[PDB]
Amino acid sequence: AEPVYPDQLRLFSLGQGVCGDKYRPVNREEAQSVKSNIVGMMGQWQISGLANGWVIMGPGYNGEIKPGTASNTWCYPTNPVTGEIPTLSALDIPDGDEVDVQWRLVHDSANFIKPTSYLAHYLGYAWVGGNHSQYVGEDMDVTRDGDGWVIRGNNDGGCDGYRCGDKTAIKVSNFAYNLDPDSFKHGDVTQSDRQLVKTVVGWAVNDSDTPQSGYDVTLRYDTATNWSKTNTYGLSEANQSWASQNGGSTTTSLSQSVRPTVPARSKIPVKIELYKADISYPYEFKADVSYDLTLSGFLRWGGNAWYTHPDNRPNWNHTFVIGPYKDKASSIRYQWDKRYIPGEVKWWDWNWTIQQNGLSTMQNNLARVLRPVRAGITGDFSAESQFAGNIEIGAPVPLAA
Amino acid sequence: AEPVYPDQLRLFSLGQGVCGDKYRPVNREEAQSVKSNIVGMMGQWQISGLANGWVIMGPGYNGEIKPGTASNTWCYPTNPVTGEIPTLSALDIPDGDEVDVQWRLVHDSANFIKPTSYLAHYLGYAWVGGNHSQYVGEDMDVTRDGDGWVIRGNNDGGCDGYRCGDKTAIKVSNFAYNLDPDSFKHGDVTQSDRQLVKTVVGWAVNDSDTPQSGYDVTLRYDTATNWSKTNTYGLSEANQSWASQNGGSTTTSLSQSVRPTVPARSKIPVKIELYKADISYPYEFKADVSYDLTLSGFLRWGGNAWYTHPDNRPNWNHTFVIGPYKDKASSIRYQWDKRYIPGEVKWWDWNWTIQQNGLSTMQNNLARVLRPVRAGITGDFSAESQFAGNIEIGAPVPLAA
Amino acid sequence: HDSANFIKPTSYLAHYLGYAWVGGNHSQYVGEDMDVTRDGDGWVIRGNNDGGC
Amino acid sequence: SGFLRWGGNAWYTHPDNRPNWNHTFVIGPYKDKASSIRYQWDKRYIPGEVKWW
């Protein structure tokens, strides 16, 4: 048939048939996804009209579904629903230095840290918000590590509840750029040093009345490192012996050559040079910002969507990747595919979060979280001992044939 | 919102609202950068109107910021400011030999050593200036090391203060050239010696009535060095044994070949020669000069911008790179990005230097330091055992098909 | 866990060295306020870090 | 492990400001200067080799 979206199912006490206005009765096929999952909607001894001659039994009957009829029919509105996070409008970030850009994203209060922290609560974390008031995720404070940013409200003054302080945190990890091909300014290029590696100088002549083809000359330079690792076995601590090894190696190589075409009856001077040293460019370009999200412990007991929520009480850490990826558990949009169908979630019960916070609640907030970040990156580039060189074909000297 | 530039913040005793003419009240967002940093502008028990229902508490309250109102409102002029070092006008250096050029840069008194040494003082160094008078950085004297230049005023005659002599120094390190593509004269090329490596002589003929393609002949020469390094383990000082190795190697290679196209019905003589030995060119070209700056100890106690200025008293060495690079701490322009926003400076408190010397003071002097050096480099080039060779296609002999 | 001939000593070292420390339920410098926990490999001792202060 | 109160010094070129420290001591025969205690103790009193740690 066609998968059902759990929170659209409804139970009616209409005896048998259809319900509401468009709510068709649930079939034996759907029962596969209904199994287990739906039990949260009924009591131990609560049985219910699956339909088509079937009744769902509750926990007291070990969750079995048997033939027969009841008066509590489960029905489903037979209408398509928004099974995805709504249109990610857009985010306009002003141009600036890469880290300056990071700051503006990080500090965009209600449009950034707000809904993020709201999820933390919805998700199942405990101390979400600073020492100021009773609002979820409000008054978070921000600091920075050279390799990331940390959101964590002030830990001073007033403090109550179970465990004083021990606040949860939102950390900004790595990030990347959807370097939009429509724009990219490469700036001036230089080197910052010198070191001669090797050169070659020579020439070729055409002692004929016809133009010739290539006078190929190549200058090449290779580097390599090796990695050996051998284990051997003699007398168990003998004659028969073992030796085994894991490698291996890596190399780099740089060539460069001329393919000059001397004109009839002439001499051509040729030079190739190879150096090594530092290089630098400046950017600048516009791109969509990809954003990594890290959440720290600890969990709110009794309000966790994580499957293992039957027990324990605290430090559950996890990261997400905010962008167009399918890196399993890190993809929030991917996770919606587990709301319906499989028990193979490999993460958390999103249906639980729906019945706790409301579908539209999170539905909206998730868009606030996931929408694209459009920005212009200013700044530059530098690198250590890279390679550099040049090739030239000098002017012809009218003397040969 | 939009980062604030610390030294533009002002406190007014106007109760509540706005200040001056355009000074808007500071928001809760800005408070993140205000935190810690701003404390230097107030006393232990000094509290102040953050605004929007918030008050900043001083050191006596452990630096917390709480809800409420005061009469000391912090405001900000809501106008964009020159958050960078001003236009680097230009510097006209006359053409001369590379080292001759270095001399002119080094000895350009008021336009070079002056503002540099002024920074040394502003920066936080102690004995800045020679034994002559009471002026900062005046009467510095210059000497030279084959690999760099040293600025250091005479150490004789009059001398007082804490520690006699022990002057600070300004050293000129490496430098590089923005070889502007608009000009580059390659001069005459020669070798300074000979040594035959290997040659090959031969020929090819066309015994048909049609022109042929390539008669490829290649002469190749390779060199290589190896690097082995193995550690092994027997009886802990046994049967089971370990061996591990780090590599690796490097090679150089030089080819060269002919791709001659013999005309129908003929004979072509071919020769390829390979030699090794010294080579030389002369330049000459114009370029922008990149300049490395090294400062020696020792620090002026009580007047240091370096974060660790709460204690100790002397030898703090550090280098800068004067040019378009992002090599972290060595980039003065990059450093301005830490004046505002992060506590993650990884260097010195530039805001401290502003409140001590004046913004416009340093603002101007930094340009005097960082402006481009335009110059023409005269001189030449030499190198040891490089490779050299030649290729020739001799005149055709009318005899084949 | 004995701590009387171990921590009440050690904690004085900490304080004497000049480390920031208070005990959840005590105004004393001595490590009276604390208990023993573990990370399997070794052990950790901490003064509650509960209650207001 | 933790933060320095204000004054104090276990192995640092102090005075300092208000940061952490996080280092160890070896209570044993292992003669290793940076964590010896007894060595450190026996040395300062002789030349002032080290700072106020």
Side-chain angles (χ1 to χ4, degrees), chain C residues 13 15-22 29 46, chain D residues 3-10 21 23 25:
Chain C
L13 175 61
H15 181 67
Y16 293 171
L17 288 172
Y19 293 149
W21 185 87
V22 300
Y29 298 116
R46 177 177 289 280
Chain D
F3 283 72
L4 185 67
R5 186 179 298 278
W6 181 224
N9 189 352
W21 74 92
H23 74 86
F25 296 104

Side-chain angles (χ1 to χ4, degrees), chain A residues 282-357:
Chain A
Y283 295 126
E284 294 181 341
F285 64 95
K286 295 183 178 180
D288 300 325
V289 179
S290 179
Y291 169 79
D292 291 342
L293 175 65
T294 298
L295 302 180
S296 75
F298 71 95
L299 296 178
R300 182 177 291 272
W301 179 85
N304 298 310
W306 187 23
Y307 167 70
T308 63
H309 67 285
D311 209 343
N312 294 320
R313 296 180 71 91
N315 186 0
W316 178 231
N317 298 323
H318 184 265
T319 64
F320 300 87
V321 179
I322 308 303
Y325 312 103
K326 181 178 177 182
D327 297 338
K328 292 292 181 174
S330 68
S331 174
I332 292 168
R333 288 183 64 86
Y334 178 63
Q335 288 297 310
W336 282 46
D337 290 333
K338 301 295 183 174
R339 289 181 175 200
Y340 56 95
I341 296 168
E344 292 288 301
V345 176
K346 309 299 182 185
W347 180 237
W348 295 8
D349 183 345
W350 293 101
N351 291 323
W352 182 89
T353 64
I354 293 168
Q355 66 181 275
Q356 295 298 313
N357 296 291

Side-chain angles (χ1 to χ4, degrees), chain B residues 34-218:
Chain B
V34 171
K35 185 175 179 181
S36 185
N37 290 326
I38 201 166
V39 170
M41 302 303 292
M42 64 191 70
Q44 180 180 26
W45 298 111
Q46 182 69 66
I47 62 170
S48 178
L50 177 61
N52 295 333
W54 294 83
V55 176
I56 298 169
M57 297 178 174
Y61 304 92
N62 204 32
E64 182 62 281
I65 301 172
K66 300 290 289 183
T69 63
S71 62
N72 303 319
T73 300
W74 284 99
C75 299
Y76 188 84
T78 304
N79 290 299
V81 300
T82 300
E84 66 179 310
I85 297 168
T87 300
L88 301 178
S89 67
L91 178 62
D92 182 348
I93 302 301
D95 293 353
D97 287 345
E98 182 178 21
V99 299
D100 190 57
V101 171
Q102 290 290 308
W103 181 88
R104 288 188 184 80
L105 177 61
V106 171
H107 292 74
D108 189 4
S109 68
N111 297 307
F112 182 70
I113 68 173
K114 182 181 287 285
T116 299
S117 66
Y118 285 23
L119 290 176
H121 179 71
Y122 300 162
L123 288 173
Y125 284 97
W127 295 134
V128 180
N131 64 355
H132 177 204
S133 188
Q134 293 78 42
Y135 293 88
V136 174
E138 298 296 329
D139 289 290
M140 297 297 287
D141 295 303
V142 179
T143 190
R144 178 174 175 173
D145 185 277
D147 293 331
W149 300 76
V150 178
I151 301 169
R152 185 175 185 82
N154 286 333
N155 62 340
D156 208 338
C159 184
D160 62 19
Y162 178 63
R163 292 174 64 178
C164 178
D166 297 342
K167 293 184 179 298
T168 65
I170 302 169
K171 180 178 181 180
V172 177
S173 180
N174 291 328
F175 49 84
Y177 303 95
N178 187 27
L179 197 160
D180 183 332
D182 290 346
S183 179
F184 179 80
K185 182 179 179 180
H186 193 282
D188 290 348
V189 57
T190 190
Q191 304 90 49
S192 298
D193 210 332
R194 287 288 185 274
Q195 176 62 59
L196 182 64
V197 177
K198 185 166 293 298
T199 70
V200 60
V201 177
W203 48 70
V205 299
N206 183 331
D207 191 29
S208 76
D209 293 331
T210 62
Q212 295 296 303
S213 180
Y215 292 77
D216 295 350
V217 179
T218 301

Side-chain angles (χ1 to χ4, degrees), chain A residues 12 30 108 110 113 132-133 191 204 208 233 305 355 368:
Chain A
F12 299 84
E30 295 81 310
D108 189 4
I113 68 173
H132 177 204
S133 188
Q191 304 90 49
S208 76
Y233 291 90
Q355 66 181 275
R368 294 180 187 278

Side-chain angles (χ1 to χ4, degrees), chain A residues 104 142 216 222 224 235 382, chain B residues 2 32 35 239 249-250 257 327:
Chain A
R104 288 188 184 80
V142 179
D216 295 350
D222 300 354
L235 179 62
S382 178
Chain B
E2 184 63 21
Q32 299 305 323
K35 185 175 179 181
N239 293 297
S249 68
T250 183
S257 68
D327 297 338

Side-chain angles (χ1 to χ4, degrees), chain D residues 12-23:
Chain D
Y12 298 92
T13 59
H14 286 173
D16 63 354
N17 293 322
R18 298 182 188 275
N20 63 20
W21 74 92
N22 305 330
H23 74 86

